[PDB]
């Protein structure tokens, strides 16, 4: 599950998502987090 911290970086995530790259990269690229749960943080609401 991918959380992000603002809405810019969910936006900016899934542009990079759009060639095919890796979540974890995307994440660290972003500040999006990837998580193993479904429920997203306060923090991480976006």
């Given at each position: 599950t991918t959380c992000?911290?603002?809405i810019v970086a969910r936006s900016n995530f899934n542009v990079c998502r759009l060639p095919g790259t890796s979540?974890?990269?995307?994440?660290?690229?972003?500040?999006?987090?990837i998580i193993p749960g479904a429920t997203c943080p306060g923090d991480y609401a976006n």
């Amino acid at each position: 599950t991918t959380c992000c911290p603002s809405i810019v970086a969910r936006s900016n995530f899934n542009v990079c998502r759009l060639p095919g790259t890796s979540e974890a990269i995307c994440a660290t690229y972003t500040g999006c987090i990837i998580i193993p749960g479904a429920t997203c943080p306060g923090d991480y609401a976006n």
